[PDB]
Write a protein that binds this ligand. Sequence first.
Ligand SMILES: C[S@@+](CC[C@H](N)C(=O)[O-])C[C@H]1O[C@@H](n2cnc3c(N)ncnc32)[C@H](O)[C@@H]1O
Length: 244
Amino acid sequence: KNRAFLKWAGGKYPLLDDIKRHLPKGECLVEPFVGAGSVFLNTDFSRYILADINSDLISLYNIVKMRTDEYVQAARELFVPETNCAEVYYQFREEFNKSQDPFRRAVLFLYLNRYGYNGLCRYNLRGEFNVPFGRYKKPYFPEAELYHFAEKAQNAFFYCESYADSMARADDSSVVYCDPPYAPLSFTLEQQAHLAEIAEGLVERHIPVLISNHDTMLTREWYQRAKLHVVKVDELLALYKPGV
DNA sequence: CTTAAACTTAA
DNA sequence: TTTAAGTTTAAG
Ligand SMILES: C[S@@+](CC[C@H](N)C(=O)[O-])C[C@H]1O[C@@H](n2cnc3c(N)ncnc32)[C@H](O)[C@@H]1O
């Protein structure tokens, strides 16, 4: 199992086997909520359409893909012991927030993700990264995961857009997997239900859609028109399967 | 996770 | 003619 080079909340890494077990085959996989892209890195589709609302994330992904060797060499220089203190961290965080250069921001983004607290990605309403120092002993530099990502990204397109726009890209040969922000144990409840509506529209166009979420009475109401599978609170896999 | 600041509401 | 109580936001 291949790991993502980013630390991300709800990476769905221990759930990969279950997801892949209920994920239909197709020419193209569409991910409206790509995140770290664990499913992307552990599946074998001919091409991928990967989207997310986070512009820094999508920007980073395209840079790692197109300027791989340049990026790895630049980002590696920040994974040294000298940068592992709070004072240096908050200066790099400041440099990130003031920079208008996509490459430099992408380089610092990896640093902030590995040196920041719990790999959190948090912004204020100004759009400024404000995750505090993580105080780690020895942050790992994901050089292998970076190169593996770039290799797989050769057949992937990245888009910075909401789920409704990315799911509209799906066609007859597509499969859609959705990993939205977790429902109550930002992404509103109305958006949670609207996601299910779009999936119902797609499944009538003979486009298979798989949704992962918490197993609650509220999520079961949303995904009531789908085949429900309980994993291991519990994890819910809502599969929308077209009837040929 | 926590506290503090920013901002609104009521009466 | 006011300000404590609430709600949201910022950030260690
Ligand atoms: C990794 S997925 C959810 C993972 C896991 N279920 C959890 O909640 O911890 C979260 C991602 O969805 C993206 N996202 C949030 N709202 C979105 C939206 N409206 N449209 C597309 N992507 C969105 C965020 O950028 C974030 O990276």
